[PDB]
Amino acid sequence: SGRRLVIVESPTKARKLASYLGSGYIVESSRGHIRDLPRAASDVPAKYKSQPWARLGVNVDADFEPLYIISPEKRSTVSELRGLLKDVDELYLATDGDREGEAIAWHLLETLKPRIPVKRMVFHEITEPAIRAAAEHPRDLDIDLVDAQETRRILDRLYGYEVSPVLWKKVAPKLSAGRVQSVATRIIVARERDRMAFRSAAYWDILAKLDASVSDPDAAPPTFSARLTAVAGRRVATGRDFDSLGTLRKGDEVIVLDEGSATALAAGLDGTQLTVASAEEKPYARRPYPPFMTSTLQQEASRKLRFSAERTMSIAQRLYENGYITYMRTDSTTLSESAINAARTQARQLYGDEYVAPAPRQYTRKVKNAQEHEAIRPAGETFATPDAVRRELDGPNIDDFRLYELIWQRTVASQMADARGMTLSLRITGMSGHQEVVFSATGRTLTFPGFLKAYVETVDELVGGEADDAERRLPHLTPGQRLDIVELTPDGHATNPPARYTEASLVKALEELGIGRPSTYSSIIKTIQDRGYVHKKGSALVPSWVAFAVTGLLEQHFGRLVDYDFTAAMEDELDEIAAGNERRTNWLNNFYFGGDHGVPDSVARSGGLKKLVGINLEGIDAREVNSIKLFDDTHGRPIYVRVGKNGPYLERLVAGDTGEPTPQRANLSDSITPDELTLQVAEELFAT
DNA sequence: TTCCGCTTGA
Ligand SMILES: [Mg+2]
Ligand SMILES: [Mg+2]
Ligand SMILES: [Mg+2]
Ligand SMILES: [Mg+2]
C-alpha cells in the first residue's frame, strides 16, 4: 500500500511506536542530532579551512551562515536512513516537539534530501488515539523555531570559541569558557569567597529544662526544653543577628551574652519558678511533593541514595531502556490520568483509603502554554511492584532498584492526602533576681502523616535543617501557669560560614536561575571537574585557583557573559525569534557587533562581543589578571596567588638585601582549599 | 586548545 518512514530520536520509542503502528511503517531513530558545527579545525572541509572563520564555523561576515557537517559518530546512522528513504512512499519527521527537536527534523531534511512528501507531527502520548491524532493532522516545519535553535547554537559557539582564547593568553592554555560552565564555576567560586571573607562570632544563651506536672499532673509531656530569648526587654542575639564579619546587624537592639554573663543569669535564677506568658497554637497542612522531574530526581538521589549526577542518570537510562520508568530527561511534573488513577490505586492498597487524597492532585509548571513531556514515573498503566523490580534486577548493582523505589514512592506520595498537624509558640517569663528574662520554645505535632508515610524528602548534608516528619512535642499550657526550673545550662555557640555546594544544591541553583537543561545537569558537573575548575571534597564541590583566575578575569572584563541573569535574558530574546518580531540575523548582528537591544548592560550596548574581545587582547595585563587577591600580612604587604606553568603558586613582594621588590614565593597544592588558606597557613609554607 | 544540547552505543 504505502511504505512510510517515521523518524524519532529515541530507540525506546522506535520498538514502542512500531507496535502501535504495525506493518507499512518503518520506525528508526536518529539518536539525537545528526549534524553539528565542526568541533575542531580538522573537522572543517578542505574548501573552508582557508576561510578566515574556519575556527568559528560561522560566517559572521555573511549574515551568520553556519557550516553544518555530519557528526562522525552519527555517520553510520545517516547511511541507514538514506537507504530506507529510497524504498518508501512518504517521510514522517516525528522528532520531539521542542526547539532542539524541530531543528533535528530540519537537519534530517537537509541531510536526507527526500523527493517524497514530508509530514511533521509530534508524538507525546504513546497510544493508538494519540498516534492517529497527530498523524491524521500533520503540520509544517516551524522555521522560526529552527532560526531560534541556530541563534542559540551560534551564540554558544561565539561565546566559547572567542572567549576561551582570552584565557589562553591570560591564564593557561587548553582552558575553556562557556555560557553555562563559566557561570556554574562563578557560583562555586562566589561561595568560596563568602567562606574566605567570613568572620565567626561567639554568642551564649541558657538552655532550661522545665516541669509542668506540679500545676497539672495530667500533662504530656511533663517536661520540655526552652531557650533564653530576652533579658530586660532586650533580645538575645542568635545566628541571624550577626553578619558575615562578626558584627551585629540589628545594632542597638540585641544583647550578646558571654560565658560569665550567662552563667550569672543561670546562677541567680535556679530555685525560682517560671510563668507562662502566652502559648499560641496554629494549624498547618503540608501539600504532597510534586512528582519527579530531572532536577528533583538528581537532588533526592544525591541526598538519600548518595548517587552522583552521572550515577543517577546512568541508572535512569537503564530503567527507561527496559521499560520501568518514563523519559528521565524532563522538566515537567505532570501526570497522565492513567498514572494518576494508578498511583491512587497502589497507595490505597498500601495505606488504605484514609491516606488517599480525596481530590485529583496535579502539579503543573510553565514554558510556553502547551510546548511542554511529562514527569518521571513508573511506566505503563499498571505500576510494576518494587518487589518484582527487586527480583528482576539482581547482581551487585542493586542501585537500579534503590532508585526505582524512590520513583515508585515519590509518585505514589504525590496522589496522597495532605499532612495535618499543629505548631506551638510558648513564651515563658521569669525573674533572674533583678532582671526580667523571657524564655521561648516551639514544637510541631504531626496529627495526620498522610503522604509522609510513603515518601519524605531528605535534608541536605551540608545546609542542614529539620525533616518534614520530625515531631517536637510540647505540653498544652495555660497563660499564667507556673513552671518549675529543673535544669539550667548556659551553652555557648559560634556562627558558621556558608555551606559548600553539593551536586544536589548546585543543580537546584542552576534550575532556579534557568541555566542548563534537564539533559545537561549531569554534564555540567562532569565538565567543570574535567576542565580543572571544581573538585569534590567527599560531597562538597570545592573550586580551584584556576577557577579563581578564570572567573576573576571573566567577571572583570566580560561581566555580562557570566551574569546569572544572562541565560535567562538570552532565553527571552530567543523566544521572540521563535515567534516573529525579531529576526535571526538582526539579533546575532547586535550581539557580535553592537546595537540598540537588550538590557541596559547587555553586550549589544557594550559594542558587541567582537569589540569586547579586541580591547582585552590589547589592554589587559595577565600579571594583574592572575592576581587572586587574598589579604595583607602583618606589615601590610599584599599576598596574592598566581597561576603559572608549573602550577598555582603563592607570591608576595618582600624586601631583600637591596630592598624591594623581591618576589617571595611558595607552592600550592589542592590539599589546602581556598577557605583554609589563612594568613597563618600562608606564613607557614612561606618559611618552609 | 575551546562551546551547548540532543541522544545512544563505540
Ligand atoms: Mg529529544
Ligand atoms: Mg542553646
Ligand atoms: Mg495542640
Ligand atoms: Mg529582543
XYZ file of C-alpha atoms (C1' of nucleotides) and ligand atoms in Angstrom:
702
model
C 0.000 0.000 0.000
C 2.327 2.715 1.266
C 5.686 2.170 2.960
C 6.006 5.151 5.322
C 9.184 6.064 7.211
C 8.890 7.531 10.718
C 11.970 9.033 12.385
C 12.083 9.751 16.120
C 15.006 10.459 18.454
C 14.915 7.568 20.956
C 15.251 3.850 20.104
C 12.977 3.050 23.054
C 10.208 4.861 21.172
C 11.090 3.008 17.952
C 10.185 -0.509 19.097
C 7.298 1.010 21.061
C 5.984 3.034 18.115
C 6.462 0.103 15.717
C 3.940 -1.874 17.804
C 1.113 0.687 17.828
C 1.704 1.443 14.123
C 2.276 -2.010 12.629
C 3.281 -3.062 9.147
C 3.889 -0.456 6.465
C 5.520 1.886 8.994
C 9.320 1.774 9.253
C 10.332 3.300 12.590
C 14.016 4.156 13.012
C 15.796 6.565 15.347
C 18.392 9.303 14.891
C 19.713 9.097 18.486
C 19.664 12.878 18.839
C 21.439 15.275 16.495
C 22.940 14.110 13.198
C 24.667 17.383 12.320
C 26.646 19.924 14.328
C 29.332 22.543 13.888
C 32.891 21.248 13.374
C 34.364 20.672 16.822
C 37.936 21.449 15.715
C 39.774 22.700 12.638
C 40.304 19.118 11.435
C 36.529 18.679 11.032
C 36.267 21.644 8.632
C 36.074 20.632 4.943
C 39.167 21.374 2.886
C 37.421 24.096 0.858
C 36.787 26.106 4.051
C 39.996 25.693 6.087
C 41.497 28.779 4.428
C 38.397 30.894 5.074
C 39.125 33.398 7.885
C 36.353 31.951 10.067
C 37.012 28.191 9.985
C 37.983 28.486 13.658
C 34.426 29.644 14.443
C 32.453 27.611 11.904
C 30.031 30.534 11.461
C 30.308 33.033 8.595
C 29.920 36.027 10.897
C 30.667 38.349 7.956
C 27.804 36.955 5.824
C 24.632 37.021 7.969
C 25.999 34.321 10.317
C 25.840 31.325 7.987
C 26.904 28.199 9.928
C 28.891 25.289 8.500
C 26.835 22.202 9.340
C 28.647 18.880 8.908
C 27.606 15.334 9.741
C 28.984 14.443 13.159
C 31.224 11.375 12.658
C 29.542 9.465 15.498
C 26.177 9.664 13.694
C 27.692 8.861 10.285
C 26.554 5.232 10.041
C 23.058 6.240 11.180
C 22.741 8.658 8.245
C 23.639 5.956 5.711
C 20.969 3.627 7.114
C 18.255 6.275 6.761
C 19.287 7.292 3.234
C 18.832 3.703 2.074
C 15.460 3.337 3.791
C 14.422 6.606 2.121
C 14.895 5.057 -1.339
C 12.207 2.404 -0.800
C 9.393 4.327 0.923
C 6.403 6.404 -0.170
C 6.459 9.177 2.462
C 8.710 10.523 5.213
C 7.400 11.330 8.700
C 9.564 13.644 10.825
C 8.372 12.642 14.300
C 11.157 14.115 16.438
C 10.475 15.930 19.703
C 8.257 18.997 19.830
C 10.738 21.486 21.270
C 13.284 23.903 19.815
C 16.126 21.380 19.561
C 13.804 18.674 18.242
C 12.441 20.910 15.488
C 15.954 21.671 14.224
C 16.750 17.948 14.044
C 13.792 17.496 11.690
C 15.173 20.348 9.585
C 18.629 18.765 9.793
C 17.065 15.492 8.636
C 15.593 17.345 5.648
C 18.901 18.955 4.649
C 20.753 15.651 5.146
C 18.390 13.083 3.610
C 17.047 15.414 0.870
C 13.901 13.396 0.077
C 11.783 13.624 -3.056
C 8.695 12.102 -1.381
C 6.175 14.108 0.696
C 7.292 15.070 4.201
C 4.960 15.471 7.180
C 5.907 16.952 10.557
C 3.936 15.663 13.546
C 4.783 15.202 17.226
C 4.019 12.186 19.426
C 3.591 12.880 23.139
C 1.276 10.171 24.440
C 2.111 6.715 23.090
C -1.362 5.333 22.372
C -3.434 4.370 19.355
C -5.610 7.535 19.578
C -2.593 9.800 20.123
C -0.813 8.167 17.175
C -3.886 8.557 14.944
C -4.419 12.158 16.103
C -1.068 13.723 15.202
C -0.585 11.638 12.043
C -4.003 12.414 10.540
C -3.485 16.120 11.381
C 0.095 16.942 10.319
C 1.957 20.251 10.446
C 4.616 22.334 8.712
C 8.215 22.859 9.790
C 8.408 25.794 12.215
C 11.190 27.800 10.571
C 11.048 30.337 13.417
C 11.994 27.554 15.846
C 14.915 26.443 13.664
C 16.190 30.025 13.451
C 15.923 30.240 17.246
C 17.879 27.000 17.671
C 20.523 28.242 15.229
C 20.657 31.522 17.150
C 21.288 29.608 20.380
C 23.902 27.446 18.730
C 25.784 30.260 17.094
C 25.611 32.208 20.373
C 27.265 29.467 22.428
C 29.771 28.972 19.603
C 30.778 32.642 19.501
C 30.900 32.714 23.308
C 33.045 29.615 23.751
C 35.384 29.843 20.769
C 36.112 33.581 21.185
C 36.397 33.954 24.970
C 38.433 30.776 25.546
C 41.411 32.227 23.583
C 41.356 35.097 26.099
C 42.007 32.579 28.882
C 44.809 31.029 26.811
C 46.641 34.376 26.660
C 45.929 35.463 30.259
C 45.723 32.293 32.394
C 46.783 28.921 30.976
C 46.419 27.013 27.688
C 43.664 24.486 26.938
C 41.293 26.310 29.306
C 37.614 26.692 28.469
C 34.881 29.289 28.918
C 31.183 28.864 28.193
C 27.765 30.374 28.770
C 26.969 27.549 31.221
C 30.268 26.217 32.578
C 31.717 29.649 33.368
C 28.575 30.690 35.253
C 28.434 27.402 37.165
C 32.086 27.939 38.097
C 31.309 31.557 39.017
C 28.725 30.282 41.519
C 31.082 27.876 43.298
C 33.846 30.493 43.314
C 31.481 33.114 44.754
C 30.506 30.761 47.588
C 34.156 30.096 48.441
C 34.758 33.852 48.617
C 31.915 34.035 51.148
C 33.694 31.462 53.324
C 37.048 33.228 52.927
C 35.610 36.623 53.936
C 33.642 35.091 56.832
C 34.461 36.109 60.411
C 32.769 33.995 63.068
C 31.252 35.409 66.251
C 30.517 33.671 69.549
C 27.232 34.052 71.422
C 25.703 32.468 74.519
C 22.256 31.731 75.939
C 20.602 29.444 78.512
C 19.043 26.023 77.884
C 16.440 25.281 80.563
C 14.513 22.058 81.115
C 11.162 22.725 82.779
C 8.405 20.785 84.526
C 4.634 21.266 84.451
C 3.421 18.189 86.375
C 3.160 20.307 89.544
C 0.394 22.626 88.320
C -1.076 19.899 86.071
C -0.226 16.196 86.521
C -2.414 15.326 83.515
C 0.114 16.801 81.092
C 2.086 15.337 78.194
C 4.976 15.657 78.005
C 5.560 16.545 81.665
C 8.945 18.099 80.813
C 10.306 20.108 77.895
C 13.273 22.297 76.985
C 13.355 26.037 76.300
C 15.933 28.701 75.462
C 16.596 32.279 76.534
C 15.191 34.956 74.223
C 15.033 38.326 76.005
C 16.735 39.843 79.056
C 15.305 43.126 80.401
C 13.274 43.850 77.277
C 16.279 43.241 75.012
C 16.524 40.385 72.517
C 19.180 37.697 72.950
C 21.364 37.552 69.849
C 21.437 34.369 67.774
C 22.925 33.498 64.392
C 20.633 35.764 62.370
C 21.802 38.878 64.257
C 25.470 38.622 63.196
C 26.623 39.459 59.676
C 29.440 37.896 57.639
C 32.090 39.927 59.516
C 31.055 39.116 63.096
C 29.414 42.482 63.788
C 25.773 42.985 64.745
C 23.059 43.756 62.197
C 20.246 44.957 64.481
C 22.643 47.499 66.007
C 21.368 48.709 69.380
C 18.597 46.117 69.580
C 20.069 42.855 70.962
C 22.395 41.696 73.727
C 25.427 39.443 73.274
C 25.727 37.269 76.373
C 29.144 35.822 77.179
C 30.169 32.873 79.358
C 30.342 34.744 82.660
C 27.276 36.798 81.745
C 25.116 33.744 81.008
C 26.335 31.703 83.990
C 25.381 34.638 86.229
C 21.833 34.758 84.847
C 21.579 30.979 85.264
C 23.019 31.248 88.781
C 20.535 33.812 90.071
C 17.552 32.002 88.574
C 17.515 28.405 89.804
C 15.151 27.639 92.659
C 12.570 30.092 91.303
C 9.529 29.385 89.141
C 8.679 30.462 85.599
C 5.297 31.793 84.476
C 3.759 31.022 81.082
C 3.040 34.318 79.329
C 1.416 33.008 76.136
C 1.011 29.674 74.334
C -0.497 30.240 70.886
C -1.049 27.197 68.668
C -1.559 27.247 64.915
C -2.621 24.535 62.440
C -0.817 23.715 59.211
C -1.165 21.404 56.213
C 1.754 20.245 54.068
C 0.981 19.627 50.414
C 2.496 16.480 48.869
C 5.763 16.744 46.988
C 5.330 17.097 43.206
C 6.352 14.113 41.058
C 9.952 13.698 39.987
C 11.452 15.756 37.199
C 15.097 15.563 36.167
C 16.369 18.106 38.710
C 14.445 16.806 41.734
C 15.418 13.223 40.890
C 19.123 14.098 40.925
C 18.690 16.044 44.177
C 16.930 13.296 46.142
C 19.214 10.596 44.729
C 22.161 12.690 45.973
C 20.839 13.388 49.482
C 19.329 9.971 50.262
C 20.997 7.400 47.979
C 24.258 9.436 47.773
C 24.291 8.988 43.992
C 26.139 11.409 41.749
C 24.528 13.160 38.794
C 26.140 10.731 36.347
C 25.306 7.772 38.593
C 21.631 8.766 38.758
C 21.108 9.388 35.036
C 23.019 6.209 34.152
C 20.581 4.162 36.240
C 17.563 6.090 34.947
C 18.786 5.274 31.431
C 18.672 1.509 32.001
C 15.351 1.835 33.838
C 13.946 3.645 30.789
C 15.505 1.338 28.182
C 13.948 -1.660 29.969
C 10.508 -0.065 30.306
C 10.374 0.600 34.053
C 10.246 4.418 34.129
C 9.243 7.070 31.605
C 11.549 9.619 29.977
C 14.060 10.709 32.631
C 15.177 13.887 30.803
C 12.186 16.123 31.502
C 11.379 19.486 33.078
C 7.701 18.680 33.724
C 5.865 17.476 36.825
C 2.579 16.482 35.154
C 0.937 13.054 35.259
C -1.390 11.350 32.808
C -4.809 10.299 34.079
C -3.713 6.673 33.720
C -0.747 7.356 36.017
C -2.844 9.389 38.471
C -5.559 6.740 38.789
C -2.864 4.053 39.110
C -0.837 5.773 41.836
C -4.109 6.284 43.718
C -4.619 2.516 43.408
C -1.203 1.444 44.713
C -1.461 3.963 47.562
C -4.898 2.663 48.556
C -3.697 -0.954 48.564
C -0.674 0.017 50.691
C -2.021 2.706 53.059
C -5.815 2.328 52.907
C -8.439 4.825 51.808
C -7.604 7.011 54.826
C -4.375 8.371 53.318
C -5.515 8.673 49.685
C -6.244 12.218 48.554
C -9.976 12.936 48.083
C -9.236 15.312 45.179
C -7.336 14.869 41.895
C -3.787 16.085 42.519
C -1.952 17.748 39.630
C 1.209 19.872 39.709
C 1.829 21.884 36.533
C 4.621 24.270 35.568
C 5.269 26.589 32.616
C 7.362 27.008 29.468
C 5.143 28.115 26.574
C 1.446 27.335 27.173
C 1.474 23.855 25.602
C 5.077 23.442 24.374
C 5.972 21.322 27.428
C 6.814 15.766 28.019
C 5.671 14.586 31.457
C 7.209 13.707 34.828
C 9.435 10.757 35.728
C 7.159 7.986 36.996
C 6.756 4.208 36.609
C 5.694 3.461 33.043
C 2.611 1.611 31.832
C -0.958 1.586 33.070
C -0.096 -0.786 35.949
C 2.944 0.070 38.058
C 5.483 -2.722 38.402
C 5.719 -3.572 42.085
C 9.085 -2.672 43.677
C 9.210 -6.298 44.840
C 9.141 -7.607 41.263
C 11.713 -4.996 40.234
C 13.860 -6.174 43.152
C 13.745 -9.713 41.725
C 14.181 -8.892 38.027
C 17.190 -6.670 38.870
C 19.780 -8.707 40.789
C 23.584 -8.631 40.777
C 25.835 -6.455 42.938
C 24.466 -3.378 41.116
C 21.216 -3.259 43.085
C 21.158 0.524 42.586
C 18.657 0.022 39.752
C 16.017 -0.954 42.327
C 17.012 1.533 45.043
C 16.429 4.349 42.545
C 13.253 2.695 41.241
C 11.838 2.548 44.772
C 12.329 6.310 45.120
C 10.390 6.944 41.905
C 7.717 4.437 42.955
C 7.345 6.068 46.385
C 7.599 9.707 45.262
C 4.941 9.256 42.572
C 2.579 7.451 44.953
C 3.027 10.196 47.556
C 2.017 12.862 45.019
C -1.536 11.456 44.903
C -1.991 11.078 48.676
C -3.710 13.333 51.190
C -2.118 16.278 52.976
C -0.261 16.203 56.301
C -2.320 17.714 59.125
C -0.755 18.987 62.323
C -0.209 21.920 64.645
C 2.676 24.063 65.883
C 3.146 25.814 69.227
C 4.793 29.067 70.326
C 5.467 29.204 74.070
C 6.619 32.468 75.665
C 7.814 31.888 79.240
C 8.687 34.792 81.534
C 10.644 34.920 84.756
C 12.881 36.932 87.048
C 16.647 36.406 87.291
C 16.937 38.352 90.523
C 16.959 41.984 89.387
C 16.386 41.416 85.649
C 13.403 40.317 83.569
C 14.121 37.205 81.491
C 11.992 35.688 78.725
C 12.178 32.039 77.653
C 10.728 30.713 74.402
C 10.207 27.260 72.904
C 8.398 25.876 69.866
C 7.139 22.465 68.807
C 5.425 20.765 65.891
C 2.871 17.945 66.047
C 2.056 15.564 63.177
C -1.554 14.577 63.830
C -2.075 13.142 60.329
C 1.035 11.874 58.486
C -0.609 11.296 55.111
C 1.917 11.209 52.271
C 4.753 11.257 54.834
C 4.097 7.531 55.365
C 5.262 6.745 51.800
C 7.899 9.366 50.946
C 9.706 12.049 52.967
C 12.295 14.407 51.497
C 15.849 14.163 52.824
C 17.665 17.112 54.383
C 20.817 18.465 52.767
C 24.103 17.074 54.057
C 25.761 20.498 54.420
C 22.920 23.042 54.621
C 21.156 21.128 57.391
C 17.662 21.550 58.783
C 14.609 19.674 60.052
C 12.873 16.718 58.438
C 9.277 17.167 57.306
C 8.114 14.259 59.513
C 10.008 15.258 62.677
C 7.771 15.864 65.692
C 8.524 18.185 68.618
C 6.037 17.506 71.412
C 5.161 20.200 73.958
C 2.540 20.220 76.730
C -0.554 22.388 76.358
C -0.028 25.085 78.988
C -2.373 27.833 80.232
C -1.439 31.543 80.321
C -0.433 32.180 83.924
C 0.693 28.620 84.669
C 3.744 28.219 86.911
C 6.665 26.061 85.763
C 9.479 24.600 87.851
C 13.076 25.014 86.689
C 14.552 21.514 86.536
C 17.896 22.362 84.926
C 19.812 25.476 83.868
C 22.742 25.082 81.483
C 24.452 28.055 79.771
C 25.748 26.808 76.423
C 27.995 28.690 74.009
C 27.735 28.858 70.224
C 29.504 30.356 67.220
C 28.347 31.363 63.755
C 29.462 29.005 60.977
C 30.489 30.011 57.434
C 28.147 29.368 54.490
C 27.906 25.753 53.398
C 29.727 24.379 50.373
C 27.843 23.343 47.246
C 26.860 19.711 46.826
C 25.904 18.169 43.499
C 22.274 18.436 44.629
C 22.412 22.039 45.864
C 24.203 23.199 42.703
C 21.626 21.657 40.353
C 18.911 23.267 42.481
C 20.641 26.620 41.922
C 21.043 26.063 38.171
C 17.384 25.118 37.653
C 16.175 28.112 39.679
C 18.376 30.505 37.686
C 17.225 28.977 34.392
C 20.733 27.803 33.448
C 21.214 24.427 31.798
C 18.570 21.936 30.685
C 17.473 18.537 32.087
C 19.774 16.826 29.561
C 22.792 18.872 30.725
C 22.765 18.905 34.553
C 24.961 15.798 34.729
C 27.316 17.061 32.008
C 27.829 20.350 33.874
C 29.060 18.546 36.998
C 31.392 16.498 34.788
C 32.647 19.403 32.664
C 33.737 21.740 35.468
C 35.549 18.789 37.072
C 37.345 17.718 33.880
C 38.380 21.245 32.874
C 40.030 21.559 36.296
C 37.810 24.189 37.939
C 35.974 22.167 40.622
C 36.803 19.038 42.621
C 34.815 17.082 45.198
C 35.708 17.034 48.895
C 33.602 13.994 49.725
C 30.284 15.523 48.684
C 31.177 19.239 48.541
C 32.110 20.965 45.281
C 35.361 22.823 46.014
C 36.770 25.309 43.463
C 40.401 25.643 42.390
C 42.842 28.507 41.936
C 42.498 28.216 38.153
C 38.762 28.681 38.710
C 39.534 31.861 40.666
C 41.663 33.331 37.871
C 39.248 32.377 35.079
C 36.208 33.663 36.978
C 38.061 36.785 38.118
C 39.138 37.696 34.590
C 35.651 36.978 33.242
C 33.706 38.928 35.873
C 36.018 41.940 35.373
C 36.129 42.465 31.599
C 33.319 40.133 30.425
C 30.928 40.894 33.255
C 27.648 40.346 31.420
C 28.727 36.988 29.975
C 28.962 35.500 33.493
C 25.909 37.222 34.979
C 23.324 34.788 36.324
C 20.698 36.891 34.518
C 22.346 36.301 31.125
C 20.951 32.869 30.219
C 17.504 33.923 31.451
C 17.622 37.153 29.427
C 19.030 35.342 26.385
C 16.147 32.859 26.610
C 13.665 35.754 26.470
C 15.331 37.241 23.383
C 15.242 33.732 21.890
C 11.513 33.186 22.468
C 10.777 36.282 20.370
C 12.835 34.965 17.439
C 10.694 31.802 17.520
C 7.503 33.883 17.193
C 8.269 36.821 14.866
C 9.042 40.461 15.659
C 12.822 39.942 15.535
C 14.991 38.109 13.009
C 17.839 35.635 13.414
C 20.416 37.753 11.580
C 19.457 41.017 13.299
C 19.888 39.635 16.823
C 23.233 37.973 16.085
C 24.385 41.201 14.415
C 23.690 43.115 17.634
C 25.354 40.531 19.885
C 28.554 40.246 17.837
C 28.876 43.835 16.561
C 26.515 46.054 18.571
C 23.114 47.715 18.505
C 20.106 49.041 20.397
C 18.765 45.881 22.014
C 18.551 44.064 25.323
C 19.014 45.109 28.915
C 20.897 48.387 29.505
C 24.096 46.494 30.400
C 23.844 43.928 27.580
C 26.549 43.066 25.057
C 24.902 44.964 22.182
C 25.157 48.139 24.270
C 28.824 47.439 25.074
C 29.769 47.287 21.386
C 29.294 43.600 20.583
C 31.332 40.555 21.521
C 33.952 41.067 18.798
C 34.967 44.524 20.033
C 34.810 43.266 23.628
C 37.494 40.663 22.886
C 39.616 43.067 20.828
C 40.100 45.519 23.705
C 41.007 42.610 26.011
C 43.754 41.181 23.773
C 45.378 44.627 23.877
C 44.591 46.469 27.106
C 44.879 43.596 29.585
C 47.942 42.552 31.587
C 47.925 38.874 32.555
C 50.070 39.603 35.624
C 47.153 41.521 37.161
C 44.591 39.005 35.879
C 46.499 36.145 37.529
C 46.311 38.108 40.807
C 43.743 36.454 43.079
C 43.724 38.998 45.910
C 43.700 37.211 49.267
C 44.732 39.576 52.069
C 47.647 41.528 53.537
C 50.226 40.328 56.051
C 51.215 41.883 59.392
C 53.345 44.531 57.648
C 50.650 45.397 55.093
C 52.278 43.693 52.107
C 49.604 42.206 49.810
C 49.604 38.435 49.311
C 48.204 37.098 46.038
C 48.060 33.773 44.190
C 49.415 33.476 40.644
C 48.826 30.652 38.157
C 51.979 29.624 36.320
C 53.380 26.940 34.030
C 54.235 24.617 36.927
C 51.009 25.320 38.813
C 49.268 27.680 41.232
C 51.809 29.376 43.486
C 51.601 31.927 46.292
C 53.531 35.176 45.918
C 54.166 38.485 47.654
C 56.710 41.264 47.155
C 59.154 41.193 50.073
C 62.278 43.219 50.859
C 65.734 41.787 50.225
C 69.367 42.843 50.583
C 68.991 45.905 48.340
C 65.370 46.268 49.468
C 62.304 45.915 47.245
C 60.974 44.301 45.123
C 61.983 40.711 45.949
C 59.162 38.303 44.981
C 58.993 35.686 47.736
C 57.039 32.667 46.517
C 55.741 29.275 47.618
C 53.897 26.324 46.082
C 50.215 25.419 46.379
C 48.593 22.004 46.000
C 44.851 21.211 46.010
C 45.225 19.782 49.566
C 44.611 23.269 51.014
C 41.210 24.561 49.929
C 40.990 28.354 49.481
C 38.915 28.837 52.646
C 41.648 27.002 54.601
C 44.447 29.315 53.382
C 44.597 31.841 56.202
C 47.432 34.267 56.920
C 48.931 31.740 59.345
C 48.845 28.872 56.833
C 50.317 31.234 54.236
C 53.158 32.284 56.543
C 53.868 28.617 57.328
C 54.614 27.478 53.770
C 56.343 30.814 53.109
C 59.141 29.933 55.541
C 59.497 26.230 54.699
C 43.448 24.259 22.772
C 37.931 25.787 23.066
C 31.205 25.926 23.046
C 25.805 23.950 24.444
C 22.076 20.258 23.610
C 20.151 16.107 21.775
C 20.552 11.036 22.266
C 22.961 6.075 22.143
C 26.279 2.939 21.547
C 31.855 2.911 20.154
Mg 14.964 14.753 22.019
Mg 21.290 26.555 73.198
Mg -2.109 21.436 70.299
Mg 14.577 41.454 21.770
